[PDB]
């Protein structure tokens, strides 16, 4: 039923195109890796070290309002 | 007429890996000379090299062949921190002849921040999928989500390990019958991995204990006609582990056998196509073939030597 | 019926131009012997086209579009290496028949390439890129031809005029089978019959319309081959792809009357053997009884 739930989540179609809608998706508390890769690419766009430490920090917190902060 | 004789690889520097295709007719080699050679076993029995090209900037540790349904694809692995996918190309004009074959790059995987030890294609049922493990100690899985786009390689997953040696080996079990899982042997404690239901993430089901020395090699055996699974490690000792799922947790290991008759490092461990025979090689310069007993103990059938 | 099994999953054998020879795939040395055995020769490259072009001369088309010819001087037991060709079809020819001054050949991709007698120069070529495997081939009124693709696609073509189009087309309503069997009558150079995959008995009237003059399924698997009598047109017998020749007594019956219950059969000429789908090992020696 997880796939069905994912489909339902994708069914909302809140707006095009948003990382804020990506956060609306993380509302379920489950985040796809692709998003993480995109975030890493954005970070890339000492910096590498920060990403390594920033990514670790994001990993440390999975709680609501933490992922948003980690993403920021 | 047929003869098996020693043949020169044509590699200036040392040869890290040799791999057979699906048929067993073709061989791929890689070395520290930065070149990949592909051999054709002619119908006249002599191996002749099909092609050799400069794949990478730095030494090429590992190579592998994908399933022949996808096409002629070889993946390579280097100290340059890249993996490359290559597709064999033959062109023939809608007329007899006119076909030309040369190595080509489908894609590059830059994501590994450090020198990569190994690369392996997953089983054919899964799709184009491969795993790689590096000095960053991060196992990465890449998929081609479109079979048609051989350049479209997405990064499916990333997991953390430890730091030093590395080897990978997928479960070759056909899926429908079994679930995907993969053993990683680095350096020393080594922990394998399985795949979760719809988390779609790799979990650590269990670990292979009793490992001695650095883990030179690991391979999973084809589970054809057997419920249980077998993995052999060439440490500086040979070990065989039996995995059984049963049914939270759903894994068990037993250690089938240990074998030190090499008296030294076991560099390579390889399995038969059926999983019937295991092989081991080491610093004694001896290659041992193994059979399973009725008791499920392993016995050495015989030993090849060389000097 | 004597079955001198000689341990080679034989691809071909034919009546002497008692007298005979044989040819086989499925080994390192491509296997072909004469005859109690005359000239058991090895060669590299398969046997797709097979016609002993004299008591000496003997031609053979091989798997890579290759075509080997030699001359079996049985007196000195020596074979003069008559002719060689690299890329005919590189698939093999998927049938072989004879034409006046040339072989009525065809191949799977359809490279209708005409080697002819002393035409080491391959002059003529209808290089129509036949998509399905053309395995139906004969001279009808040479050079009246008909390429039959593996949609059973009996398109009547030409080679004496030019242009790569086919002259006509014979087909069943559905196009179910791939090409294995046809039947050009010795009674008439126009009369034919499509032997197909269901033990499928079809008959092709050229001169009288072109409908399915027959549709009758008797044998189990796909169309193997037959042995007509080389002067008795009516007497023949029909198999299917396991090899089981039912005594399709059109001289007058058909039953379980072969030396049957084996694997497949090799090639057809009888005055004696036939050919099934998997081309396997069998023998016979009493072909008038």
3-state SS string over A6-61? HHHCCCCCCCCCCHHHHHHHHHHCCCCHHHHHHHHHHHHCCHHHHHHHHHHHHHHC
Structure token pair of residue B260: 């030190």
Number of Cβ atoms within 10 Å of the Cβ of B273: 12
Burial of C1 (C-beta count, 10 Å sphere; 0-12/13-18/19+): exposed
Structure token pair of residue C268: 């057809």
Beta bridge partners of B51: B38
Q: Give the C-alpha separation, C243 to C251, whole Å.
A: 21
Q: Give the C-alpha separation, C181 to C223, whole Å.
A: 6
Q: Is the distance from CB of C146 to CB of C155 less than 8 angstroms? A: yes
Structure token pair of residue C196: 């197909």
Residues with Cβ within 8 Å of C120's Cβ and at least 6 positions away in sequence, in order, are: C83
Chain B contact set for C44 (CB, 8 A) = 43-44
Chain A contact set for B157 (CB, 8 A) = 33
Structure token pair of residue B184: 């990683």
| A·B CB contacts under 8 A | 10
Nearest CA to B60 out of B7, B18, B26 is that of B18
Residues with Cβ within 8 Å of B203's Cβ and at least 6 positions away in sequence, in order, are: B193, B194, B195, B196
Chain B nearest-CA distance from C187, in A, is 38
Q: Is the distance from CB of C31 to CB of C23 less than 8 angstroms? A: yes
Which residues of A lie inside 8 Å of B (Cβ-Cβ)?
Answer: 2-3, 33-34, 37, 48
Q: Give the C-alpha separation, B238 to B234, whole Å.
A: 5
Structure token pair of residue C113: 């390439």
The dihedrals phi and psi of C63, each to the nearest 5 degrees, come to -50, -30
Q: For C87, which of B2, B44, B96 is closest by C-beta distance?
A: B96
Beta bridge partners of B257: B240
Structure token pair of residue B246: 């049963």
Chain B nearest-CA distance from A39, in A, is 14
Nearest CA to B132 out of B80, B93, B177, B92 is that of B80
Cα–Cα distances in Å, from C138 out to C141, C144, C237? 9, 8, 20
Chain B nearest-CA distance from A51, in A, is 12
Chain B contact set for A2 (CB, 8 A) = 197-198
Q: Is the distance from CB of C125 to CB of C114 less than 8 angstroms? A: yes
Q: Is B94 close to C111, i.e. CB distance below 8 A?
A: no
Cα–Cα distances in Å, from A10 out to A15, B180, C10? 11, 27, 63
Tokens 């190579």 sit on residue: B63
Nearest CA to C287 out of C14, C18, C5, C6 is that of C18
Beta bridge partners of B203: B194
Chain B contact set for A49 (CB, 8 A) = none
What's the CA angle centered on B75, arms B70 and B78, to 5 degrees?
170
Method for this entry? cryo-EM
Chain C contact set for B95 (CB, 8 A) = 127
Beta bridge partners of B74: B65, B86
Structure token pair of residue C286: 């009493």
Residues 3-42 of C with CB under 8 A from B: 28
What's the CA angle centered on B297, arms B295 and B303, to 5 degrees?
130
Q: Is B97 close to C87, i.e. CB distance below 8 A?
A: yes
Q: Is the distance from CB of C123 to CB of C166 less than 8 angstroms? A: no
What's the CA angle centered on B25, arms B21 and B28, to 5 degrees?
50
Q: Is B96 close to C111, i.e. CB distance below 8 A?
A: yes
Tokens 């007429």 sit on residue: B1
Structure token pair of residue A66: 């933490």
Q: What is the DSSP letter of B53?
A: E
Beta bridge partners of C188: none
Number of Cβ atoms within 10 Å of the Cβ of C102: 18
Q: Give the C-alpha separation, B26 to C285, whole Å.
A: 44
The dihedrals phi and psi of A51, each to the nearest 5 degrees, come to -65, -40
Q: Give the C-alpha separation, C19 to B18, whole Å.
A: 53
Q: What is the DSSP letter of B124?
A: G
The dihedrals phi and psi of C277, each to the nearest 5 degrees, come to -70, -35
């Amino acid at each position: 039923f997880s796939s069905f739930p994912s489909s339902m989540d994708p069914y909302p179609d809140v707006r095009s195109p948003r990382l804020f809608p990506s956060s609306h998706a993380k509302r379920t508390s489950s985040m796809g890796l692709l998003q993480s890769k995109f975030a890493s690419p954005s970070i890339s766009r000492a910096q590498g070290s920060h990403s390594p430490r920033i990514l670790p920090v994001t990993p440390w917190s999975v709680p609501a309002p933490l992922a948003p902060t980690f993403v920021i | 007429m047929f003869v098996a004789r020693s043949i020169a690889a044509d590699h200036k520097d040392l040869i890290h890996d040799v791999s057979f295709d699906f048929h067993g007719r073709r061989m791929a080699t890689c070395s520290s000379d930065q070149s990949v050679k592909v051999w054709d076993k002619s119908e006249n029995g002599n191996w002749h090299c099909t092609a050799s090209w400069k794949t990478h900037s730095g030494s090429v540790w590992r190579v592998t062949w994908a399933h022949p349904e996808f096409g002629q694809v070889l993946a390579s692995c280097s100290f340059d921190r890249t993996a490359a996918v290559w597709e064999e190309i033959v062109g023939e004009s809608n007329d007899k002849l006119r076909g030309q074959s040369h190595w080509v790059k489908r894609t590059t995987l830059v994501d590994s921040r450090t020198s990569v030890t190994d690369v392996k294609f997953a089983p054919k049922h899964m799709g184009l999928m491969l795993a790689t493990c590096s000095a960053d100690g991060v196992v990465r899985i890449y998929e081609a989500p479109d079979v048609m786009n051989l350049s479209q390689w997405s990064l499916q997953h990333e997991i953390s390990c430890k730091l030093s040696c590395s080897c990978i080996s997928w479960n070759p079990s056909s899926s429908r019958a079994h679930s995907p899982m993969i053993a990683v042997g680095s350096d020393g404690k080594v922990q394998i991995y399985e795949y979760n239901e719809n988390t779609r993430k790799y979990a650590k089901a269990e670990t292979l204990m009793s490992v001695s020395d650095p883990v030179h090699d690991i391979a999973f055996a084809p589970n054809l006609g057997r419920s249980f699974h077998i993995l052999a490690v060439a440490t500086k000792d040979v070990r065989i582990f039996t995995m059984k799922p049963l049914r939270v947790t759903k894994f068990e290991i037993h250690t089938v056998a240990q074998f030190d008759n090499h008296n030294s490092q076991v560099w390579r461990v390889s399995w038969n196509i059926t999983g019937t025979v295991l092989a081991s090689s080491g610093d004694d310069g001896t290659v041992r073939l193994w059979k399973a007993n009725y008791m499920d103990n392993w016995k050495c059938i015989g030993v090849l030597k060389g000097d | 019926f004597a079955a001198k099994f000689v341990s080679h999953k034989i691809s071909r054998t034919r009546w002497r131009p008692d007298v005979f020879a044989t040819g086989s795939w499925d080994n390192e040395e491509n296997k072909v012997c004469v005859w109690k055995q005359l000239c058991d020769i090895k060669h590299p490259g398969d046997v797709m086209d097979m016609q002993f072009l004299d008591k000496e001369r003997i031609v053979t088309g091989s798997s890579t579009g290759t075509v080997t010819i030699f001359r079996h001087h049985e007196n000195n037991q020596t074979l003069s290496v008559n002719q060689r060709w690299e890329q005919a079809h590189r698939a093999p020819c998927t049938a072989i028949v004879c034409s006046s001054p040339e072989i009525v050949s065809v191949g799977e991709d359809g490279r209708i390439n005409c080697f002819r007698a002393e035409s080491r120069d391959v002059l003529r070529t209808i290089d129509d890129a036949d998509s399905s495997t053309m395995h139906g081939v004969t001279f009808l009124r040479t050079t009246e031809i008909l390429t039959v693709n593996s949609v059973g696609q009996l398109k009547l073509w030409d080679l004496r005029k030019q242009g790569n189009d086919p002259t006509q087309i014979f087909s069943v309503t559905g196009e179910r089978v791939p090409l294995h069997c046809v039947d050009r009558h010795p009674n008439q150079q126009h009369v034919v019959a499509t032997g197909g995959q269901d033990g499928m008995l079809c008959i092709w009237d050229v001169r009288h319309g072109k409908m399915p003059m027959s549709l009758l399924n008797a044998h189990e698997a796909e169309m193997w081959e037959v042995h007509f009598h080389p002067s008795n047109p009516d007497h023949l017998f029909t198999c299917s792809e396991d090899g089981s020749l039912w005594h399709w007594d059109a001289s007058a019956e058909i039953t379980n009357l072969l030396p049957s219950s084996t694997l497949s059969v090799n090639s057809l000429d009888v005055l004696l053997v036939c050919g099934t789908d998997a081309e396997a090992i069998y023998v016979t020696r009493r072909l008038f009884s």
